Design a binder for this molecule. Structure first.
Ligand SMILES: COc1ccc(-c2nc([C@@H](C)Sc3nc(N)cc(N)n3)c(C)s2)cc1OCCF
Ligand SMILES: COc1ccc(-c2nc([C@@H](C)Sc3nc(N)cc(N)n3)c(C)s2)cc1OCCF
Ligand SMILES: COc1ccc(-c2nc([C@H](C)Sc3nc(N)cc(N)n3)c(C)s2)cc1OCCF
Ligand SMILES: COc1ccc(-c2nc([C@H](C)Sc3nc(N)cc(N)n3)c(C)s2)cc1OCCF
Ligand SMILES: O=c1ccn([C@@H]2O[C@H](COP(=O)(O)OP(=O)(O)O)[C@@H](O)[C@H]2O)c(=O)[nH]1
Ligand SMILES: O=c1ccn([C@@H]2O[C@H](COP(=O)(O)OP(=O)(O)O)[C@@H](O)[C@H]2O)c(=O)[nH]1
Lengths: 231, 231
């Protein structure tokens, strides 16, 4: 009865900015930052999170499997914690996930494989480890909906340029372009098949977020509220 | 209501030999062979397994973390599948598991960390997951007892010969010696402080298997029967 909705989009699309706006508008609405975002900048996980982040950057062909598995594991734990810990005293509870286990596999992991940073065996083991590990533990992480925050690679690039973090100034447009295409095919075009038949029919809301919405988001929030009523 | 017993033992101590003997003595007795034993002679799991096993051997400092995670995932599934699909119509059901998720971590994975085949981050990540894979999936697999087929490292090396796998003739005594000590600390002196609380009080039966037993196994089985009557 808690509604689970994932916020999808490219790097620097505005997902953190969006969910940080959404969380303050209602008591019935909670948020789960993706752990990779927390790793980027201390617990057992945060330490391993930092190290593997750096290792991955320094050698993706060595670390893409290690990182993807841990990133997904951590997300499932961060999400299950929120399902069981939050929104019991809410009449219309909504839980907004920053990305999803589907993003983990069908965007990031899938891209690393296609970039040759995972070999066939690693990608094959990862999919098995994902197919199985979600279809019980994170069985009822099933999402009620997806909000797709669509921004072009250039916007995202400028929002990386604008965010100003030293470590990401070097992310190349080509990669952003690569991630954009994977999102479009899953979320906009719907060609990409998955091993999770319900996702073929789960309702998506696309929002166009090229235009800065920081001072001006009501049309966007109006669209979210309207989307929630159809679920 | 199925009693769960792990048979634990160094490389070629005689575990396969034993379990297969035990499987024949009662329609109530069934065995779960270990994933890696399967791989060491097809399904996505077999292919993935054969590949990861070969790369492990070639370059353990690259493939230990991956191998270990897939080994343990695989074991967890098998021991689930065996609880579901075996000994349904048994009065006194007993499942003998060939090794356990505990030898996975505290013998093998630990040894590979100790021999610098996993770094700290790999090892803490492994331990982080292991803790959770079991908690989320592996609850029903908790052990009623352990049987330690205890043999000298010299015995096992000799036994590798008798088994005649060309591949295996390269296994050094110093490796067996490290695995042996870890078996002793864990299962004899009961020094190893596992994170899993119920293990401190799990019954252990320790069987000197240094003599050949293939055609002279009655007395070992008698101890198993006594042990099993105490659980
Ligand atoms: C020098 O090359 C690289 C440097 C860094 C990367 C990284 N990609 C990423 C993410 C986009 S992968 C990711 N992010 C998430 N947020 C979640 C998830 N499961 N996976 C990093 C955090 S670092 C990827 C790199 O290479 C791609 C080669 F094609
Ligand atoms: C050149 O160095 C190595 C060569 C081979 C190994 C291997 N260990 C193993 C297993 C004993 S590790 C294992 N076996 C199992 N049966 C189960 C499990 N969870 N882990 C191999 C199949 S290959 C390990 C090696 O490094 C040992 C470092 F401690
Ligand atoms: C093909 O080359 C690349 C592909 C992707 C990247 C990415 N880097 C990043 C970050 C810089 S990794 C990161 N971000 C942080 N904020 C902090 C930190 N320690 N590590 C992504 C999120 S994607 C970086 C790439 O290299 C460009 C500079 F080497
Ligand atoms: C420190 O050096 C070693 C440590 C461990 C080994 C091991 N090899 C093996 C087997 C030969 S791996 C194996 N066994 C099989 N039966 C089949 C197969 N494909 N791979 C172990 C079970 S342990 C071998 C080692 O040295 C090999 C010398 F090259
Ligand atoms: O409408 C927007 C959305 C985002 N940003 C900024 O652009 C950067 C990227 O946004 P965010 O970090 O939320 O993106 P994410 O990577 O979480 O998608 C941030 O520094 C934001 O403050 C902005 O100025 N206007
Ligand atoms: O009592 C025994 C136990 C084992 N073996 C031999 O030792 C080798 C290793 O046996 P097993 O496969 O049971 O070892 P494990 O399963 O412990 O690796 C095989 O050739 C067995 O035939 C034997 O001759 N007598």
């Amino acid at each position: 009865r808690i509604k689970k909705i994932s916020i999808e989009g490219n790097i620097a699309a505005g997902k953190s900015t969006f969910v940080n706006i959404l969380k303050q508008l209602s008591e019935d609405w909670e948020v789960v930052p993706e752990p990779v975002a927390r790793w980027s900048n201390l617990t057992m996980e945060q330490k391993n999170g930092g190290n593997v982040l750096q290792m991955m950057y320094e050698k993706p062909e060595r670390w893409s499997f290690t990182f993807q598995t841990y990133a997904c594991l951590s997300r499932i734990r961060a999400q299950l914690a929120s399902l069981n810990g939050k929104l019991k005293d809410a009449e219309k509870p909504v839980l907004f996930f920053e990305r999803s286990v589907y993003s983990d596999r069908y965007i990031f992991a899938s891209n690393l494989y296609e970039s040759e940073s995972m070999n066939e065996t690693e990608w094959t083991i990862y999919q098995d480890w994902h197919d199985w590990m979600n279809n019980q533990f994170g069985q009822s992480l099933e999402l009620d909906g997806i909000i797709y925050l669509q921004a072009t690679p250039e916007t995202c690039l400028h929002r990386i340029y604008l965010r100003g973090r030293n470590e990401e100034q070097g992310i190349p447009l080509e990669y952003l372009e690569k991630l954009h295409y994977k999102h479009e095919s899953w979320l906009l075009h719907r060609t990409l098949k998955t091993n999770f038949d319900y996702l073929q029919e789960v309702p998506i809301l696309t929002l166009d977020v090229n235009e800065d919405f920081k001072d001006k988001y009501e049309s966007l929030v109006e669209k979210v509220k309207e989307f929630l009523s159809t679920l």
